[PDB]
Amino acid sequence: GVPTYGAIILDETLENVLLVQGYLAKSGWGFPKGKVNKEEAPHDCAAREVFEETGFDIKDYICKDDYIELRINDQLARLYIIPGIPKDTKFNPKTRREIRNIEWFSIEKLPCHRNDMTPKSKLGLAPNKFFMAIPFIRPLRDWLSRRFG
Ligand SMILES: CC(=O)Nc1cccc(NC(N)=O)c1
């Protein structure tokens, strides 16, 4: 798959993260991110996708070594960590045929896994609107503990 880049934006307290809600297949909440263009650098792709989805320019805040990267089904997603963005920032997508809403979420309240259906003796996982964010939540909490404590 084509690599994706974007950002985990935190507020000044480090207890809230900025998620975006798409439509259709991307109907749930997830971090702002998207697919790299041919010949586009990782930092430039992250900033472009975040600016398209939130209207906030991370370019001057990106740190090269500060990111979480996961390989999911043989597609690589790298989110640059961007702390200290004030919660009263005005976020507006460029692309409202693509983004329904933009909200801050408490990191401690977000799930880091889906719930099974063991009460129903059925296999699989129950739907969760944070599906696209979930894989990054534990690595993020671990990264924030290492970096700040
Ligand atoms: C394209 C990309 O960034 N990969 C990604 C990111 C978050 C969650 C999932 N989860 C899944 N599709 O199963 C995949």
Write a short abstract of this structure:
With 149 residues, this protein is of the alpha+beta class. The chain has helices at 42-54, 134-147; strands at 4-9, 16-21, 29-30, 33-35, 67-72, 75-82, 101-106, 116-117, 122-125. A hairpin with a 7-residue loop joins β2 (16-21) and β3 (29-30).
Strand order of the largest sheet: 4-1-6-5
Q: Which kinds of small molecule does this entry bind, naming each only once?
A: N-[3-(carbamoylamino)phenyl]acetamide
CATH fold-level topology: Nucleoside Triphosphate Pyrophosphohydrolase
Envelope shape: globular
The CATH architecture is Alpha-Beta Complex
Report the helical percentage. 10-25%
- What is the CA-atom radius of gyration, in angstroms? 15 Å
**Number of distinct beta strands:** 9
| Topology as a string of helices (H) and strands (E) | EEEEHEEEEEH
Question: Sheet with the most strands?
Answer: 4 strands, mixed
Number of helices: 2
* CATH homology-level superfamily: Nucleoside Triphosphate Pyrophosphohydrolase
